[PDB]
Amino acid sequence: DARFDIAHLARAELFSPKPQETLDFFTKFLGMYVTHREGQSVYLRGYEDPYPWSLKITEAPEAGMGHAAMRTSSPEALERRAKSLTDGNVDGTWSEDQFGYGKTFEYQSPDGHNLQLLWEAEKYVAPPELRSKILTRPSKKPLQGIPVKRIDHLNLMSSDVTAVKDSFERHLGFRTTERVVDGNVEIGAWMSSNLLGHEVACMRDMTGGHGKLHHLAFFYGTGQHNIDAVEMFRDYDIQIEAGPDKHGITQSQFLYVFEPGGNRIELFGEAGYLHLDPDAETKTWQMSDIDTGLAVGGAKLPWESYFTYGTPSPLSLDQHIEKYAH
Amino acid sequence: SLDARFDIAHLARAELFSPKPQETLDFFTKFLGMYVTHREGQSVYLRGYEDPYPWSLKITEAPEAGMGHAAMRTSSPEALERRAKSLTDGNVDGTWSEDQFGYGKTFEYQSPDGHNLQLLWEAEKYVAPPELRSKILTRPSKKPLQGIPVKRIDHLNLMSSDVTAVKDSFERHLGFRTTERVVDGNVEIGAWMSSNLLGHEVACMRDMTGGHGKLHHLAFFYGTGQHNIDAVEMFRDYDIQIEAGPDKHGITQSQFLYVFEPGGNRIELFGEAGYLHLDPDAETKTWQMSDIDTGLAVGGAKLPWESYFTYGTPSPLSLDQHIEKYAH
Amino acid sequence: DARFDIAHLARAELFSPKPQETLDFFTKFLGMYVTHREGQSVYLRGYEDPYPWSLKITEAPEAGMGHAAMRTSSPEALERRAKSLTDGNVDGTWSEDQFGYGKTFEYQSPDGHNLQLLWEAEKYVAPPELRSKILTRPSKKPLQGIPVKRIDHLNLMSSDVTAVKDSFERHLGFRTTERVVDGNVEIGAWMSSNLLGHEVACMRDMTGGHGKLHHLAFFYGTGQHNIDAVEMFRDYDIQIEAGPDKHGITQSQFLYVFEPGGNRIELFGEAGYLHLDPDAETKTWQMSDIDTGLAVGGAKLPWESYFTYGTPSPLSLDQHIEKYA
Amino acid sequence: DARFDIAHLARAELFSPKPQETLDFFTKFLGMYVTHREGQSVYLRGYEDPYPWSLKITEAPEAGMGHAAMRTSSPEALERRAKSLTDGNVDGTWSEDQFGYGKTFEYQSPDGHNLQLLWEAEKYVAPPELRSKILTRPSKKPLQGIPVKRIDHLNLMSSDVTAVKDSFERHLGFRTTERVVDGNVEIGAWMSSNLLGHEVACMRDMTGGHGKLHHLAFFYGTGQHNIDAVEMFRDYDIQIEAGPDKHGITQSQFLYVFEPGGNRIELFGEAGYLHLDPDAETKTWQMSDIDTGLAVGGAKLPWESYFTYGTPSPLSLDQHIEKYA
């Protein structure tokens, strides 16, 4: 078991030292619905996210990931996974303090990332006037910015990719669909519990840091929307890191930008390659053939930011780029 | 283990009968750019560049069109035995075989309406010769330079005299869940089912002519809306009959394009994957036949009653005669 | 000479018995900028329209086109064209009472359509905060709805297509790139004075009416935007007539919807086929073999409205569809 | 005056040391039709090119442009333009030795680029079975590779951009829609004689060479096709330089690759922004503030090739990239 115990990535919490600007980024540009406000946080969801929220913005001294929560495939699976972690000496705590959700098990990845598991999730129902004629779509697509449909995946930065990968595979039942190696060292791993290539990935922190967030990605499902989104970001002064293009690794149409708070956000295009074959061997990418893996087109990922910057960062984004530029 | 939700992995292949085998072959190679991996007797085997096994499509010469069979691959060898046993204990006649190139032990059976279905686990993983391998590691073969190449098989739609009976079989015997359905009063006239995050890999719609065990259509995946636009322009200028599309069905949020291959079978070109069912606990969405506009098409597309809701293969009348008959 | 006297379609005015709803349609869904408000009318422009406005919405008892103005290639061209019309005995009037524009020659088509020619047009300059980093783009693309870039073309419904075609060809110097005939009668003509396949089209009125507007089109330039637009119209209750698909005639990616006031509006995708060849013969389509001409894809153009409904209409859109169904 | 004398870019000839590989590139990947073969040359056309050919591939010791020919808007216009060049002391030669075309005037730009003017051009008619149901389309879109529709534009490298610019403006009547400057020095100019932002561009040669070709571009009109094309080139081992993305300058969706012979070829997506305004002022970009001009997206144009490599090149592409690091 453990194999089919995890259903999908339900939500993530981002910390931001410029909470209002981050909120404006997610509403004005990415068209997310705000469903709740309390204390230091604001809760949002894309029009096709199934629960009250998929994103939580929380004011903080620095940027980074407050947590990421995965929803299990049943309440039985939740008990199973939490039991596995506890039996494995992984410290965890049960709680039930989040709007729109129930009992949740909180724990740390081997590198310090805040992870959570839950089953109890309220099915979001929009106000009558905002319900879509498309029955599988809870809310009508907003008429603001270039609206994302839902959260897509999470990419964690780590001092030890294998340690994190092992935890997801062993305790959560994830399978690694693709990975990148240097010698016999894993510097990148993409993992999934369903037909998606991945919903959680882990890449080596080239600065020697640990427990950082590389990026949180949101789904468009249409390549043209990354083109529309980047033109928007360019004209409305949002820093563009790379893209739009497509990574050979995971066959993902990507667009990386930096929201006002300092976190890296990815806009994801076409779903791409779905893993229908139930027992496909993990594909291992090498340095010798990493060109296509990084980008099918002419896109070039900046060493001074993409492979080195993650949040929280001891240096500001500008300070960082200047330091690793050489 | 008694939990059967994950026993079926996906739709592996389908076989189409055609009274014009060569023209049908040309359709799938010249226009849809599929690779031919085997030839035997009166059949030709093909695969899209991203299909994982030796073939996902088999074209067989026959006096009439229709579906020879459809085979689903399980998630493990154990799942195959469990599903086969469920069917057997349910008094469903079944037969084991190992007849096909590129595959192993297979369980053959028929749906309540007579559709030829199959279950299997043993499948050879297709490996392209060095020269045809893609630099994209999850892609077995390079995308062909012929026509508008489809990536893989996507789903199948079966026409039936009793949708509810077919749905019940997939649900209780194969572990499928029904994501969406359409009812007319208190009668189910359409059901879309799945065992994974796809909205569906197998659908069933009521035969409005009174027939049964027919094939409504076999669908192939592009994943890009623009390719349905490119495809239809190609079909129009190269004399392939177009039924409807490109547009998008509200039901299953699928970008569709329906055309008729030379043999008479309806084939669908599928665009963006659309809406993935991430929520593992979502209730079936039920559409009313009386409030179906959005469900049929988000755009201005119109599905002809003279063919879309009445034509399936094999058909008592040839396509032309069928349309003329049901038009008035 | 003559051929190059008309530069492009500058603007159009739409009459609407539901002016507020019509304005909401163009701003909330089509993301057009409002540049001026005055009495019974509102002025708008797409973010890439060169002048203060390309669309004027005016409150009226019925729907329809108030007018359409074409800009000339020079001031000399304007005098030449106006003189040609006058010499042809076409009644015309000079004026200068519109915001953002100058001297204008007003006249009517052989079928009663209100047309105008002008040269003096102010070049819109957006406030600094709204200027685009793309220098050829006056304003940033709005963050509302699915923003149209600019006006594209006009399609006039007439009781005599050839009569209208002759006016544009002989007096304005337009060429007819494509046409549709039924026996010896022209029932459709698409005319241009530049690289575009057409900026003004004229189709036969099959109801015995005359001087009506079939539709006004706005440019996206991207096929996916018609897909996004129709999904928006569907979920936000705007009546969809046909599309998205592509007409073989003019090779245009189309999407036809009805705005609240009753006028037909087309959302236009890829520019399509540009007429680079300077002396290509007019392509003539036959009504007897028009399938590809109407739609490359599977789109079906409803006779109950597409070939029969135009504004102003004696019957409401609902009554019309019911009647011709 | 001469403002409308030139209609469009009719064709171009590319030299290649690997003629067969270059031919395969344009046929197997870009789906162009071969319409003629003579001596050491092959003639091709996109399915929507109006004449027998838009591209001529000629075997040669080095890469580069054999010539580029523009078609005038009339025979009178040809006489006028040639007259202007001759009166300006520009050496010219009249000839008529090209398949599918008639009398043409051959001359050189101030930097040595081989240019030509002509009016007589045969209208290509495809064999019965290859004619398209779309009447404005001469031949059916091929079922090979990702077929380009037609030639789009040319970009010339020059030791003196202003000199080349003056020639096109003064002698051909072209207008400069956009340009890039550094102080009082023009390092780039985009010119047109019609609604297109440009059909001919000129950029500074940073190596000190002259009369070279930066790139020849072909039209798709669809952004997705550049995405499709780049994936094809990547998996079929064609060197990719930059893109798919969009230049703020000229608002063009670009994809630059190197064909087997060494020439840079651009695949062009959406037509983009059409210059409908007849008297729009030239948009001048500053070299110091050109981020958006180079690319709206995150694309990065490599200095080691994009701004320095042109054909013919004294160094092989490999050696050139190595040299400029």
Ligand SMILES: O=C(O)/C(O)=C/C=C/C(=O)c1ccccc1
């Ligand atoms: O994350 C992806 O989907 C992707 O294609 C990027 C992979 C990047 C790397 O190979 C990488 C390697 C070491 C450290 C950081 C990043």
Ligand SMILES: O=C(O)/C(O)=C/C=C/C(=O)c1ccccc1
């Ligand atoms: O199959 C689909 O995705 C779809 O939108 C079509 C639904 C068609 C029907 O409702 C239907 C009803 C009765 C008989 C045949 C077809």
Ligand SMILES: O=C(O)/C(O)=C/C=C/C(=O)c1ccccc1
């Ligand atoms: O306007 C177009 O581009 C187009 O393809 C529409 C042509 C419609 C007609 O053939 C038509 C014929 C008679 C009366 C009205 C319209």
Ligand SMILES: O=C(O)/C(O)=C/C=C/C(=O)c1ccccc1
């Ligand atoms: O050609 C274009 O559309 C474009 O955006 C490229 C502009 C490149 C330059 O500014 C340039 C400047 C100096 C030397 C070569 C090239």
Ligand SMILES: [Fe+3]
């Ligand atoms: Fe990612």
Ligand SMILES: [Fe+3]
């Ligand atoms: Fe289907």
Ligand SMILES: [Fe+3]
């Ligand atoms: Fe139109």
Ligand SMILES: [Fe+3]
């Ligand atoms: Fe270019």
